[PDB]
């Protein structure tokens, strides 16, 4: 049937997101646990904020590869919308994929508190937030262009020759995507902590649960979607890679 | 002959694990010796703990690439045992790898301290234990998922067609598997130093031998197996990508 | 139509360079803002200057991968000009890229300071200049070889068969080229911040505009060209791997 | 003719070695220039000794790829001997390849002094040396096993299907080799600064020119060759990958 594999192709998206978050989170939180804030431990010496940026782009690359020929290796709500606005994701999928992504991200970040809870709460919760020093418009713009780069990669990465089984869904070359994320994280983590993935953003937000988080949560949906839409427009028409 | 190509690989495992544990732990002890205790050493200016995580990751990347069409690139009881529940490595072929790998680790581990026994001993010796602040359940829960992440990555990394020499043992591109190892560490080192490898943990426990360390060791066997047995279960049925 | 697939790529260059300069410099300024001046910031605990070098490297890796079968993945006047002496990019097709790339950089550069004009200005703005202690000849000699390393890497990275859309423009795997960019930086950043990209340097010089910076800028054009013209010469004849 | 391409296949080995060294060197020296010794600059903050290890394994990977289908992508005297002892390098080549490698390495490190000369001399010269704290036997053993890993990769990396033009010389998969180097550098740089490449070792030695360097230069030829020989024995016979 069509309903059973679609369901299974969605089950993957949920699982991979769960893994992706908590690794990236417990990397961030593990970093923030080893690297001291004010006092009570060692300054620096952690994985560096280079190590954190490795966690995201690295876990993504792995999972995209793990979830390539199944779901399509989407793992990102912004990416899902891009591919959808590219008229190549069967509507109902995206609605489910977002539920899939946003579910597991809550789960993932949830498994992190359970482990520590102590050093979790004090240390950021791994939740995306505006860094003090920048205006909101600045932060919004970075998320837009940032996500744009990620999504621009995806479409370029789609090989028409190779496709997912029991579907017309584009399988993705797993490496440059995860590397594109890593580049963006290197560029962004100061400003916002790098959202460009509403699943992640909404994920830790539910768990960490802070006024400043919820107040600034509105960006990492708007910003990314704007970019993913722009990247779709940039790829399928003004580069016209459709034909 | 079945024995000559089998032992061909049963050794290749042992060697890789020897090489694996050697390069990795020699980095860790190196990192320790760079920052060290008050009087001697400078902080931060080592490889960074990221660099340690690199060592464990990339070594898996190359040793699998070398032992791909030979042993199948396990270098891990969990990965091997995981491929047994998956009914892809016949019983007797597993138990050998299980033992063959463990010895290499020890041989790899013991080789390291002979270089730096003075330093080695004072600085944790790359032994898998709980960092204080974490309840034992936290440490256990960390290993199972971390192993799962890898073993699942290992399974999605199974070519349906190509075999290692003279068996039904998988052969596929390793680069993701190395990252899975590398990734997990970055998030798991703060807790246990990242085990997700029963032989590696066992090999560290044998040489170092510290009671509080040695009686926590049970976790890094109990844990990883479950995470592997789950990933095998999930990938083979809950995804059922094996059905054809 | 010749114009529609040409401009198809003439834009793709411009955009990549815009994206390139944006992501890279936003990291640098980020690094600056993390350590900063006495009162504000913590040292070391940034990405590390290695992380900066990563940004320049990997961005070349992905933007070439995106613009491989489109523009041919130059994102660099030197690389483009280098492929002109190699007689592989017809005259008029180069001059466009030469200009098309430069604008993107500026557009990419200008976009960055609009985010952080306060910080940006106080912290070097990713502008290519000589760090004190180096004579100007040292800085020049650094850029030429660094560019050579890349442009030579670019040439050894030329598939004899596959073209970009509707031209005779090469298409081959990018991963080495990204590393060449990444590698050179690690050894060249201490001197100039690593130029090896005339458009990038020009783009940085336009927005930042500082006289002592702006009148040293001539180096990062004079240099890279020579290193590119050499690599093209060496690869095409001294190795003569192009002859068939 | 046979003499012209052989000569050209040797010209590549020289060039790539020149590049490899000075980049790795000026990375090491650039690191040591930015990172202070006792006083006169900033502590840490450099590329880290992770960044240095990236320079070696990274430059190698690039150049091996750049010099694959030509020379065979050898770049290392130890590797040359291994492939030779594997009965698959036409004797005369190795003698020339060593001259090729050891020449450019001197050149490379030479271009570094010219640039700085000031901060060159005080800061190690990028020359391999025993780290104070270890015995010589310890240091020798690391170079042996270290080089072994590098060379074991090479043979495993040799694809019999693909071969260099106008030769029977094995082209190498450029990535795992350069990555194997990187791993070893991460493991070794404390102890010796990682030799496993007599070209590099003899390269900076000529330029830096120190008593302690020349005294301890004897290791990074003996050690590596022992390993490269062992890796050859480990590969071609007790793994018997010859047939």
What is this entry, summarized?
The PDB classes it as membrane protein. Four copies of one chain form a homotetramer. Chain A is mainly α and 243 residues long.
What is the element layout, followed by pairings?
The structure is a homotetramer.
Chain A: H1 3-34, H2 48-66, H3 77-85, H4 92-115, H5 118-122, H6 136-157, E1 158-163, E2 170-172, H7 174-188, H8 198-208, H9 211-215, H10 219-236
Antiparallel strand pairs in A: 1-2
Helix pairs in contact in A: 1-2, 1-4, 2-7, 3-4, 3-6, 3-10, 4-8, 6-7, 6-10
Subcellular location (chains A, D): Cell membrane
Function (chains A, D): Aquaporins facilitate the transport of water and small neutral solutes across cell membranes.
Membrane topology (chains A, D): Multi-pass membrane protein
Label this structure with key terms.
homotetramer; 243 residues; mainly alpha; Glycerol uptake facilitator protein; two-stranded antiparallel sheet; 2 strands; 66% helix; membrane protein; Aquaporin
What does the model show?
- Four copies of one chain form a homotetramer.
- Chain A has 243 residues and is mostly helical.
- Chain A has one domain (1-243): Glycerol uptake facilitator protein, CATH 1.20.1080.10.
- Helix content of chain A is 66%, strand content 4%.
- Chain A contains ten helices and two strands; from the N terminus they run H-H-H-H-H-H-E-E-H-H-H-H.
- A two-stranded antiparallel sheet of chain A has the order 1-2.
- In chain A, helix 1 (3-34) runs antiparallel to helix 2 (48-66).
- The longest helix of chain A is centred in the N-terminal third of the chain and has 32 residues, at 3-34.
- The two termini of chain A are 31 Å apart.
- Chains in contact: A-B, A-C, B-D, C-D.
- At the A-B interface, helix 1, helix 2 and helix 4 of A face helix 2, helix 5 and helix 6 of B.
- The PDB classes it as membrane protein.
- Keywords: Aquaporin, hydrogen peroxide transport, membrane protein.
- It forms a tetrameric assembly.
